[PDB]
Amino acid sequence: MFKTILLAYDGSEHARRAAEVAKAEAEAHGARLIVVHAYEPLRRRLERAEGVLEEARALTGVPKEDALLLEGVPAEAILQAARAEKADLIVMGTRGLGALGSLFLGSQSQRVVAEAPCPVLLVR
Amino acid sequence: MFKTILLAYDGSEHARRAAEVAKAEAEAHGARLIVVHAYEPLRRRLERAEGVLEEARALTGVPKEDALLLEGVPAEAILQAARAEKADLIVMGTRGLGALGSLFLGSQSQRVVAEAPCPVLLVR
Amino acid sequence: MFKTILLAYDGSEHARRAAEVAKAEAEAHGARLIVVHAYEPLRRRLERAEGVLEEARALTGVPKEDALLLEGVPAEAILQAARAEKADLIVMGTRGLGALGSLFLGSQSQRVVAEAPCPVLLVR
Amino acid sequence: MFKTILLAYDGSEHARRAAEVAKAEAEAHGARLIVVHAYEPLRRRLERAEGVLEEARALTGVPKEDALLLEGVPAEAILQAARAEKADLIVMGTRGLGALGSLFLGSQSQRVVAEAPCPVLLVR
Numbered sequence: 341m342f343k344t345i346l347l348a349y350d351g352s353e354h355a356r357r358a359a360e361v362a363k364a365e366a367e368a369h370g371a372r373l374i375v376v377h378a379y380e381p382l383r384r385r386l387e388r389a390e391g392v393l394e395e396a397r398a399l400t401g402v403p404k405e406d407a408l409l410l411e412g413v414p415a416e417a418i419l420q421a422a423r424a425e426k427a428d429l430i431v432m433g434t435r436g437l438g439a440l441g442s443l444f445l446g447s448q449s450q451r452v453v454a455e456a457p458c459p460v461l462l463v464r
Numbered sequence: 465m466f467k468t469i470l471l472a473y474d475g476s477e478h479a480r481r482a483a484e485v486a487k488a489e490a491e492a493h494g495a496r497l498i499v500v501h502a503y504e505p506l507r508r509r510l511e512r513a514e515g516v517l518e519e520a521r522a523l524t525g526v527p528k529e530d531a532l533l534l535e536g537v538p539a540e541a542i543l544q545a546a547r548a549e550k551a552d553l554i555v556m557g558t559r560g561l562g563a564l565g566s567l568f569l570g571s572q573s574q575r576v577v578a579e580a581p582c583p584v585l586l587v588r
Numbered sequence: 589m590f591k592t593i594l595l596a597y598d599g600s601e602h603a604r605r606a607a608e609v610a611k612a613e614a615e616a617h618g619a620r621l622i623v624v625h626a627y628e629p630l631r632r633r634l635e636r637a638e639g640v641l642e643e644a645r646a647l648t649g650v651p652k653e654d655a656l657l658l659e660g661v662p663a664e665a666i667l668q669a670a671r672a673e674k675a676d677l678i679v680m681g682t683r684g685l686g687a688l689g690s691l692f693l694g695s696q697s698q699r700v701v702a703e704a705p706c707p708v709l710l711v712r
Numbered sequence: 713m714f715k716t717i718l719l720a721y722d723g724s725e726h727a728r729r730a731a732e733v734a735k736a737e738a739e740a741h742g743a744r745l746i747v748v749h750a751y752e753p754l755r756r757r758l759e760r761a762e763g764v765l766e767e768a769r770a771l772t773g774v775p776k777e778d779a780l781l782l783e784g785v786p787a788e789a790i791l792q793a794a795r796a797e798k799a800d801l802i803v804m805g806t807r808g809l810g811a812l813g814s815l816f817l818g819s820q821s822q823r824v825v826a827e828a829p830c831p832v833l834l835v836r
């Protein structure tokens with residue numbers, strides 16, 4: 341099972357735990373791992389986003405072509421990449437940088453769980 | 465990663481897909497797999513519940529001592545078993561027998577996601 | 589505004605607060621108030637359900653023809669009555685008898701909020 | 713009932729419907745109505761935010777001192793104003809400008825529903 345795994349990374353402590361889990365899943369299933377980081381609607385925003393994505397590439401060890409910067413609402417970006425890469429599993433945190441502890445699950449995780457093309461592994 | 469995996473099984477088509485995923489995860493991580501099925505508050509209810517649990521034991525191949533019938537609100541039962549068995553991953557469906565398609569995620573999955581002691585793998 | 593108001597009543601302390609709010613809204617808007625209580629799939633279940641509905645009729649003062657017992661998943665029952673009675677506002681508790689405090693909003697309120705034909709007033 | 717009503721306004725079509733409902737509720741209950749619009753973390757952001765708040769003041773007719781610009785995560789801002797103004801009812805849309813139709817309820821409405829000091833009237 342699981343030939344392609346997609347990690348959604350936002351640089352939060354939950355996403356660093358999710359990156360560890362995704363690296364472990366890819367090794368255990370012999371899968372190809374893709375990491376993605378979305379930025380929302382300049383040079384400054386892209387520099388910041390590239391650095392966050394660099395961190396995800398460093399924690400997972402994936403090749404450059406498998407670490408993607410995407411633009412837009414995070415969940416939409418994650419879902420489009422997942423359909424494009426034919427992901428069999430999406431790994432993401434239950435919460436992220438914007439956590440206040442008032443939602444039961446972060447809004448981008450909620451959206452992905454509702455529309456995902458495959459199983460989603462939520463990491464606390 | 466993942467030494468103990470807990471599958472929450474309600475006999476729905478989502479939970480049969482979740483049982484396949486949990487069997488595959490346990491084999492890939494060399495983990496011990498526990499399957500649980502909760503029944504809500506007689507002889508008839510227990511007979512029905514034992515049969516549903518038998519199906520989960522047949523699809524996963526776990527030993528008898530690792531297939532548990534529990535009582536109460538499903539999510540509470542799942543969470544207590546998970547803390548008791550020191551589960552490192554809970555696998556459950558996004559929806560179950562009571563699905564109407566109006567919730568974004570079933571209520572028992574919502575409760576587990578909010579209170580789980582470990583990552584939760586949601587299977588559609 | 590609001591000519592017909594529907595109260596969804598389950599006999600919980602939240603629903604008793606919601607009944608007070610619904611009585612106050614109906615008086616303030618000069619509206620017709622309907623109270624509904626759903627029971628899930630005998631003589632015993634119906635006796636219990638009629639008594640809960642009697643309590644809602646006593647707290648709101650509505651006429652008998654405007655206090656309805658319905659069957660099925662609560663939210664489905666509430667929504668069908670609301671479309672049937674052309675309700676302009678549904679008043680219900682944020683939580684109910686089955687509250688464990690783990691959901692952000694009870695599952696029947698979640699379903700109604702997602703599919704309602706009109707505004708929904710959530711009472712804590 | 714309801715002596716102080718707080719409308720959370722984001723300039724979306726749902727919030728314009730919510731403003732109509734809030735104006736009608738304030739008139740029916742003889743209540744004081746407060747409208748609030750939050751902006752997230754310059755001159756440009758404040759100009760845009762003041763114009764959105766002007767629209768809410770125009771649709772509800774409230775006095776200047778009762779139309780407030782607030783800063784921060786919207787739900788936090790709404791909740792703090794509600795405790796400060798001792799609001800007895802918060803009226804807000806089920807969805808807003810960022811709606812994609814994938815959440816069951818928008819994230820700021822979710823947060824307010826979970827932490828509100830009073831009933832919340834959700835307007836579709």
Ligand SMILES: Nc1ncnc2c1ncn2[C@@H]1O[C@H](COP(=O)(O)OP(=O)(O)CP(=O)(O)O)[C@@H](O)[C@H]1O
Pocket residue numbers: 348349350352354355358376377378379414431432433434435436437438439440445446447448449450819
């Ligand atoms: N820009 C982004 N790029 C990639 N993944 C993202 C992302 N934003 C969020 N995620 C993923 O979603 C997970 C859950 O975070 P989410 O953004 O849903 O909640 P949050 O705690 O930040 C509150 P909010 O719903 O207001 O954003 C993160 O751990 C991460 O895996």
Ligand SMILES: Nc1ncnc2c1ncn2[C@@H]1O[C@H](COP(=O)(O)OP(=O)(O)CP(=O)(O)O)[C@@H](O)[C@H]1O
Pocket residue numbers: 472473474476478479482500501502503538555556557558559560561562563564569570571572573574695
């Ligand atoms: N009695 C039970 N025992 C074990 N697991 C259960 C269970 N009930 C539900 N689950 C687990 O929860 C998953 C999601 O189903 P859930 O019960 O949350 O939603 P549902 O679609 O049945 C609507 P509802 O929230 O009304 O019950 C199921 O696939 C199963 O893994």
Ligand SMILES: Nc1ncnc2c1ncn2[C@@H]1O[C@H](COP(=O)(O)OP(=O)(O)CP(=O)(O)O)[C@@H](O)[C@H]1O
Pocket residue numbers: 571596597598600602603606624625626627662679680681682683684685686687688693694695696697698
């Ligand atoms: N059988 C029923 N008949 C009428 N209204 C009901 C109902 N069950 C619930 N409701 C309405 O829904 C409100 C919220 O309760 P809800 O049932 O959604 O959550 P809960 O706290 O009971 C946990 P659960 O989702 O497991 O049932 C109740 O206050 C009541 O207004």
Ligand SMILES: Nc1ncnc2c1ncn2[C@@H]1O[C@H](COP(=O)(O)OP(=O)(O)CP(=O)(O)O)[C@@H](O)[C@H]1O
Pocket residue numbers: 447720721722724726727730748749750751786803804805806807808809810811812817818819820821822
């Ligand atoms: N900046 C803001 N100021 C005041 N009220 C706001 C607000 N943002 C949202 N709201 C209120 O919340 C309601 C629901 O919108 P919400 O922002 O929760 O969902 P949304 O559809 O914009 C998706 P998202 O959760 O990504 O923002 C809006 O109709 C409005 O009443």
Ligand SMILES: [Mg+2]
Pocket residue numbers: 350436437438439446448
């Ligand atoms: Mg976030």
Ligand SMILES: [Mg+2]
Pocket residue numbers: 474560561562563570572
């Ligand atoms: Mg169920």
Ligand SMILES: [Mg+2]
Pocket residue numbers: 598684685686687694696
């Ligand atoms: Mg209930």
Ligand SMILES: [Mg+2]
Pocket residue numbers: 571695
């Ligand atoms: Mg239920």
Ligand SMILES: [Mg+2]
Pocket residue numbers: 722808809810811818820
């Ligand atoms: Mg919004």
Ligand SMILES: [Mg+2]
Pocket residue numbers: 447819
């Ligand atoms: Mg957001």
